[PDB]
Amino acid sequence: NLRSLETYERLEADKKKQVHKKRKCPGPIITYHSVTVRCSRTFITFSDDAT
Amino acid sequence: EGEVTELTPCETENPMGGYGKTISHVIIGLKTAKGTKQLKLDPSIFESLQKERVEAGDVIYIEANSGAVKRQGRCDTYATEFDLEAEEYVPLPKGDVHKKKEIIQDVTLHDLDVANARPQGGQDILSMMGQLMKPKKTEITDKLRGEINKVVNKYIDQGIAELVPGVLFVDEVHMLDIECFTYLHRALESSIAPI
Amino acid sequence: TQRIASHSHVKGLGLDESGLAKQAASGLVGQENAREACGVIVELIKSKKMAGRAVLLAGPPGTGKTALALAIAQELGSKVPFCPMVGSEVYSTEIKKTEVLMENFRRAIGLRIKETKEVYEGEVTELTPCEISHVIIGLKTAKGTKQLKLDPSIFESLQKERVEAGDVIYIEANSGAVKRQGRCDTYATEFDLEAEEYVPLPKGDVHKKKEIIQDVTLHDLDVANARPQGGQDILSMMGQLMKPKKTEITDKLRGEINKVVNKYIDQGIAELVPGVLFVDEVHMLDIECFTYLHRALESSIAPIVIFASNRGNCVIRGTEDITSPHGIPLDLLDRVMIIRTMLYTPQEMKQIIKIRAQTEGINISEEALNHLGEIGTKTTLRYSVQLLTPANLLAKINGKDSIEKEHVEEISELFYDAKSSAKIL
Amino acid sequence: SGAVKRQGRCDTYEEYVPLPKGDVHKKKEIIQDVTLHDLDVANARPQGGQDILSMMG
Amino acid sequence: VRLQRICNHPGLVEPRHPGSSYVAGPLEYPSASLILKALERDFWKEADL
Amino acid sequence: ETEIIEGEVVEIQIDRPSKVGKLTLKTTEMETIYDLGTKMIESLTKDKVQAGDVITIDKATGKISKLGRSFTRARDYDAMGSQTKFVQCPDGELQKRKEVVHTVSLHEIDVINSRTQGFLALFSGDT
Amino acid sequence: GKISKQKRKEVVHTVSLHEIDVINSRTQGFLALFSGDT
Amino acid sequence: GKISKLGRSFTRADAMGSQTKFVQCPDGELQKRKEVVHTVSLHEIDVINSRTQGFLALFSGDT
Amino acid sequence: EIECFWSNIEQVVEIKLRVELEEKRKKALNLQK
Amino acid sequence: ESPSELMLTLCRCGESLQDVIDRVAFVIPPVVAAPPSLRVPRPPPLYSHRMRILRQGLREHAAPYFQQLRQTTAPRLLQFPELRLVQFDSGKLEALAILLQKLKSEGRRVLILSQMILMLDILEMFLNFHYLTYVRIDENASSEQRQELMRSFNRDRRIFCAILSTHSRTTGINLVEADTVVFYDNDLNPVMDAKAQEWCDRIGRCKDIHIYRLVSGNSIEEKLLKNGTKDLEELADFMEQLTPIEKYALNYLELFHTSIEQEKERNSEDAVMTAVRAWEFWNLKTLQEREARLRLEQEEAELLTYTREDAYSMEYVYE
Ligand SMILES: Nc1ncnc2c1ncn2[C@@H]1O[C@H](COP(=O)(O)OP(=O)(O)OP(O)(O)=S)[C@@H](O)[C@H]1O
Numbered sequence A: 001n002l003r004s005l006e007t008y009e010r011l012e013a014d015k016k017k018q019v020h021k022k023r024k025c026p027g028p029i030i031t032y033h034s035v036t037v038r039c040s041r042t043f044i045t046f047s048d049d050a051t
Numbered sequence B: 001e002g003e004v005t006e007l008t009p010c011e012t013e014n015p016m017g018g019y020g021k022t023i024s025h026v027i028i029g030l031k032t033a034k035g036t037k038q039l040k041l042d043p044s045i046f047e048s049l050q051k052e053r054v055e056a057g058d059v060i061y062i063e064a065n066s067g068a069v070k071r072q073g074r075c076d077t078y079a080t081e082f083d084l085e086a087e088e089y090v091p092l093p094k095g096d097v098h099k100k101k102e103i104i105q106d107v108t109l110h111d112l113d114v115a116n117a118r119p120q121g122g123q124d125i126l127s128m129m130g131q132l133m134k135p136k137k138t139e140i141t142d143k144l145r146g147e148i149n150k151v152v153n154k155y156i157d158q159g160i161a162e163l164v165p166g167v168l169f170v171d172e173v174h175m176l177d178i179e180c181f182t183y184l185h186r187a188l189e190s191s192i193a194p195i
Numbered sequence C: 001t002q003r004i005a006s007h008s009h010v011k012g013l014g015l016d017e018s019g020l021a022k023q024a025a026s027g028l029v030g031q032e033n034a035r036e037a038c039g040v041i042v043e044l045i046k047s048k049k050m051a052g053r054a055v056l057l058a059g060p061p062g063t064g065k066t067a068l069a070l071a072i073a074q075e076l077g078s079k080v081p082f083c084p085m086v087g088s089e090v091y092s093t094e095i096k097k098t099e100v101l102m103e104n105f106r107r108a109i110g111l112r113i114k115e116t117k118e119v120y121e122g123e124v125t126e127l128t129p130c131e132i133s134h135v136i137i138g139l140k141t142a143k144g145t146k147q148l149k150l151d152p153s154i155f156e157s158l159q160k161e162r163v164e165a166g167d168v169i170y171i172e173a174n175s176g177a178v179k180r181q182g183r184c185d186t187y188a189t190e191f192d193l194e195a196e197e198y199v200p201l202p203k204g205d206v207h208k209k210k211e212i213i214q215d216v217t218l219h220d221l222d223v224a225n226a227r228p229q230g231g232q233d234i235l236s237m238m239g240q241l242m243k244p245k246k247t248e249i250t251d252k253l254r255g256e257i258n259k260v261v262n263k264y265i266d267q268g269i270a271e272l273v274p275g276v277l278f279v280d281e282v283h284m285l286d287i288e289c290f291t292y293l294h295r296a297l298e299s300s301i302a303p304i305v306i307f308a309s310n311r312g313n314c315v316i317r318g319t320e321d322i323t324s325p326h327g328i329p330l331d332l333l334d335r336v337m338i339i340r341t342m343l344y345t346p347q348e349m350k351q352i353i354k355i356r357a358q359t360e361g362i363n364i365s366e367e368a369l370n371h372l373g374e375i376g377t378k379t380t381l382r383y384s385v386q387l388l389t390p391a392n393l394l395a396k397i398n399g400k401d402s403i404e405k406e407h408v409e410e411i412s413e414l415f416y417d418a419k420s421s422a423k424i425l
Numbered sequence D: 001s002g003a004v005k006r007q008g009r010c011d012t013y014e015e016y017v018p019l020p021k022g023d024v025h026k027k028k029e030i031i032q033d034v035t036l037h038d039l040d041v042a043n044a045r046p047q048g049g050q051d052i053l054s055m056m057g
Numbered sequence E: 001v002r003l004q005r006i007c008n009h010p011g012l013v014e015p016r017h018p019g020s021s022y023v024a025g026p027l028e029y030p031s032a033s034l035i036l037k038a039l040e041r042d043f044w045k046e047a048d049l
Numbered sequence F: 001e002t003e004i005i006e007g008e009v010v011e012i013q014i015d016r017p018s019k020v021g022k023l024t025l026k027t028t029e030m031e032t033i034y035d036l037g038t039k040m041i042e043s044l045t046k047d048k049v050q051a052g053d054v055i056t057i058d059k060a061t062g063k064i065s066k067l068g069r070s071f072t073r074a075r076d077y078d079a080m081g082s083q084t085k086f087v088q089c090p091d092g093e094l095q096k097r098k099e100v101v102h103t104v105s106l107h108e109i110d111v112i113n114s115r116t117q118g119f120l121a122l123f124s125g126d127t
Numbered sequence G: 001g002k003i004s005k006q007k008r009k010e011v012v013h014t015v016s017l018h019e020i021d022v023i024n025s026r027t028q029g030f031l032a033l034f035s036g037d038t
Numbered sequence H: 001g002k003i004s005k006l007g008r009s010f011t012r013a014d015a016m017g018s019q020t021k022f023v024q025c026p027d028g029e030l031q032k033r034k035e036v037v038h039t040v041s042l043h044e045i046d047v048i049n050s051r052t053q054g055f056l057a058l059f060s061g062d063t
Numbered sequence I: 001e002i003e004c005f006w007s008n009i010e011q012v013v014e015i016k017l018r019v020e021l022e023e024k025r026k027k028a029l030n031l032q033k
Numbered sequence J: 001e002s003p004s005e006l007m008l009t010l011c012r013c014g015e016s017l018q019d020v021i022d023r024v025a026f027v028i029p030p031v032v033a034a035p036p037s038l039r040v041p042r043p044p045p046l047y048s049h050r051m052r053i054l055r056q057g058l059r060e061h062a063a064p065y066f067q068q069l070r071q072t073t074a075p076r077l078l079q080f081p082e083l084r085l086v087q088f089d090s091g092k093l094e095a096l097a098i099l100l101q102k103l104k105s106e107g108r109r110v111l112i113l114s115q116m117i118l119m120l121d122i123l124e125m126f127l128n129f130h131y132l133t134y135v136r137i138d139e140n141a142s143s144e145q146r147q148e149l150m151r152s153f154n155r156d157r158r159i160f161c162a163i164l165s166t167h168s169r170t171t172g173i174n175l176v177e178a179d180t181v182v183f184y185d186n187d188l189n190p191v192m193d194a195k196a197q198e199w200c201d202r203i204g205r206c207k208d209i210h211i212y213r214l215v216s217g218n219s220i221e222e223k224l225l226k227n228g229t230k231d232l233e234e235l236a237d238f239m240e241q242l243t244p245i246e247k248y249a250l251n252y253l254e255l256f257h258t259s260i261e262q263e264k265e266r267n268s269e270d271a272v273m274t275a276v277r278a279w280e281f282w283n284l285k286t287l288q289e290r291e292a293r294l295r296l297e298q299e300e301a302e303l304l305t306y307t308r309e310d311a312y313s314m315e316y317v318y319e
Helices: B045-051 B109-117 B125-132 B142-157 B178-187 C032-047 C065-076 C097-106 C152-161 C185-190 C218-226 C234-239 C251-267 C287-296 C346-359 C366-378 C381-398 C405-414 C418-424 D036-042 E002-008 F038-047 F106-112 G017-023 G029-035 H042-050 H054-060 I002-032 J018-024 J045-058 J063-071 J091-106 J117-129 J143-155 J190-203 J220-224 J233-239 J244-256 J266-299
Strands: A030-036 A040-046 B002-012 B021-031 B036-041 B058-062 B069-075 C054-058 C082-086 C109-130 C134-140 C145-150 C167-172 C177-184 C207-217 C270-274 C276-280 C304-309 C336-340 E022-024 E028-030 F004-016 F020-026 F031-035 F053-058 F064-069 J031-033 J037-039 J110-114 J134-137 J161-165 J180-183 J210-213
Touching: B002 B036, B021 B045, B021 B058, B045 B069, B109 B142, B125 J063, C032 C054, C032 C065, C032 C304, C032 C336, C054 C065, C065 C082, C065 C276, C065 C304, C097 C218, C097 C276, C097 C287, C109 C145, C109 C218, C109 C251, C109 E022, C134 C152, C152 C167, C152 C177, C152 J063, C177 C185, C185 J117, C207 C218, C218 C251, C218 E022, C218 G029, C218 J031, C234 J045, C234 J063, C251 C270, C251 G029, C346 C366, C346 C381, C366 C381, C366 C405, C381 C405, E002 J220, E028 G029, F004 F031, F004 F038, F020 F038, F038 F053, F038 F064, F106 J018, G017 G029, H042 H054, I002 J143, I002 J233, I002 J244, J091 J110, J091 J117, J091 J180, J110 J117, J117 J134, J117 J161, J134 J143, J180 J190
Parallel strands: C054 C304, C054 C336, C082 C276, C276 C304, E022 J031, E028 J037, J110 J161, J110 J180, J134 J161, J180 J210
Antiparallel strands: A030 A040, A030 F004, A040 B021, B002 B021, B002 B058, B021 B036, B058 B069, C109 C134, C109 C167, C109 C207, C109 C270, C134 C145, C167 C177, F004 F020, F004 F053, F020 F031, F053 F064
């Protein structure tokens, strides 16, 4: 029954679903990631060894 | 400054999760006549490393602040007498890897006025069309001169600039006409005027 | 609110039905004869069939010549082109003063042209070129979707605007003008943060034809055809980079535009609204300008010209010794109808001062009004109306909402007129 | 000079050449009168549309 | 009904329209084709300068 | 009336083969994760935003203006770099609307509207 | 083969000397007959 | 690294002829040091530096 | 890659589920009509 | 080289000088004309070839700068009514701007009810002015589409406003995940007004509701208020051509389903912080170790020999 409802209409309104993106392919990719660690760091990720 | 001995990425199992090939540093070995230093750069410098045709044995300049790699050429040690390409083989940088010290240039306020009034503009339609037309002298507006005054004041406040006011020598001042003397009235009463 | 200028009080000539001037009406007092003559000239301009007719407003300074000219302008309304001009404006660094006079003549003749405007607006569903004679573009509105075959010019303007897909665009077929006014609203929800602005898709037809009336002058057509800005060919594009100097438009361009306008008038797609050219300080024109006006007023295309001069026996500029009545050559005075403005009595000056006080939102006591009228009799009308605003400022400083006589006296002492200043000189 | 001009496209195969001396190899003695001013103005600015930037001239 | 439409938005009773320029057809200047052939000068009279 | 989002960059991830990305900004009061469109990704890439940058983003144009480097992230890397001077983290909401006043003169409007690149004549006096 | 939107027909054009030398003064000198920039 | 073509080979001049010019083969060293003395005036330097293509003003006089 | 395949199948499942509920509504409407 | 700057402003002490130009650049020529054409019957071949050569050469020379050459030299033939005139033309929209900004900050969602389709178009413009996302439910929407759109609004809290017509049919849309209702106007006929009020009250069955009505002061709108009694196939054909493996996957995912979330994803946040701190310490240790190794390298005598031309040619003077 609960699988029939739509993430709303449900009395116990569970929190923060927001269904994020599924990414879905962009082939081989290069990721640029800058994060706070007081300090800031950047990590560059290569999907495969070819690139 | 130096000759690129090595370009090696530092790999890590660092990321915020992820089954990829991650690097947290780019090791650049710069070799000058004085010695060799290994620099560890932001991984983002890998883009300009191959945007510039930077390989091992190339002479490069890495702005300490800008962080922009710049391939001057190739080291002249890798230069046979049977190689015809020129403006590619630059001598090995002398001295230390880490140095460009201070460049001091003296200008007049008119030089800044002229430079900012008509930009060089040698990159596009400005280039061909403006050069093709004759570069006449223009009547620079007080707006430009006020902006130049503001910029020079900010440069002096930052300590990058020093103001050395000079002296204007008008010989044969009797050759000026009444309009010129009337203007001199207002020009001599400005806080920015010379002697 | 609106700023109060020296003529903001004039709303018309204040003439009754029969053309006789009411003593005070529409912000004008006195000059009844001149106002009646100006009413006749207003009727002349409205009649619309006479070209090259010139009138001269003659009288000492302060008598209201410019006021009467602007009253004529108010009577005509914004529909009729009223081009104000000063004699000092002919001396241009780019074009000969004859060209300036002719341009001012041409912009006093107005055209109302009904034009069919072909509009393509919609969301770009697709954009497919064909080698480069074509671009197949799909446009979506609320009404429906259509795909259109457009010229390479429109395609290449689309590339200028950088429209790709899901973009709402507005194409004017006549001018080949493309406007990328944003991306469609349906794509706002795509991302939390995107670097563009989303606009709702158009709700009308993709292809809309609209009849609009355009207000233009003959000078607009002359300038547009002498400095062409339409067309996308490279030769004209590189000419657009030149400094846009004013050029001495030839009589041939004006004749060709006259032919085009005549064709439009025949076709019923245009109506001519010839206006009036107002040259204030006409005494500033030199002999060459007046001698050209001789010919410019014979043209069947010329507008109604109004001249104003306050000079009594001035030398004609450029002649160096020739004294003519109003600084104007006699041969030109033979072509004009002279309307004379007389000096004002103390009572008319008091009325004018009260009108200016009303326009500037200043309350002035009867004592102050009488004192200011006495001052104006002694000094000039212009001096008195100038005292009103400073006097009101002093009254507000004192905390009173009206100008009393003491404030007028104070402002009179603080400031001087030309006669007092000349005395101390 | 090596300069070349295609005089026509005679639709026989829009102009075809006459036949007084209708030889392929044509040469005759030419005289052209030119003033020194013509040479000066010819050398005052580039020769026009031949060159990359003289096109904009 | 009209007053309610005006109260909702005046763009319902009269929209603001885009301001446009008047597109005037290019002026056709007619002339003889022989005019453009002026200054051509005869081949076999032009030397190599 | 502008609508800017001003915050401290605590995370930016850009995936590149159209580009994908995510950006987290925080004020003193709140933090929000933004899924980036291609235009915004390009703007950030041009302006080279990192964690620890204080930036303002125009909702209409997407213009990125960076006010400095922040209290929390602050120091940045352990690479060549340079010295450091830090600004404060913005307070309140990320999106704060706000009304800005721009002053011009009639002469400036005349010059800009006259010559299609007549703006440079406001300095050269070539109008 | 000139293209444009039932016999040979003849056309008469009277051209002034000024028109001839303005047309032939520049590549697009015929524009100067209208702008006056001759 | 500037290439200037000054002529065609001495193995033909053998049916050609155009804007081309015919030159015989250089003799001696392929690589040559050379001293060239350029005579100009201060005005010529001024007009060369006046603008990007300012050397054209030495001809037109449009300085 | 297999996860992407299963997510694509999940999208198909969700659209089919929505369409089936809509057809359930339609069938009820026709039945009561 | 020569100096240059961009810090120069014009009159404002501010932005990047293209925004300034865009702000104040609005004039359009009253008349725009294409350059006059030379109408010659059968133009000479030499002239036409010369003109063609010139045009061809000028292009392919400006080709690298053609986009720039066009951004310049392109006249402004159109000026549109700016988007701010909406919300200035109407005091209703002026008040609705404040109301919606407050509601946005407070987190509530809104559905705007207006009788006029055209005012819904104007509302679309106004909402885009404020960068507010919305969904539009009109008379022209079928019941299936009405349900689909209202359902998308219910699913997504990233779309802020629901724009709905009082003249549309509110049949099956009983649940609206919105807190407040804005009536842009009162419908003139009590039938539609009453039906809209019942729909709002239905929305008010569960949780609290805030209903807003916009009434223009000193207008007939004020008088009328407070009285007015004076009187499927796509899924199918897509399900076909679904190769065998995917039909199986359809059945499997139908019966067995999944759930990515396990209610403890927050541990990933704390786990990520722990991993980041541990990596910072590991990086610091590796850096110290590399520096120690570099110092140890420096320990050995870096120079043992020199070159021959730098040995027997005096090489230097103490000086
Ligand atoms: N009869 C009038 N009724 C009302 N205002 C008048 C009248 N005559 C003049 N004025 C005004 O008094 C002021 C001075 O007159 P102006 O017309 O501006 O100057 P002027 O004297 O007409 O200029 P000229 O060419 O030397 S006569 C202006 O504010 C006019 O509007």
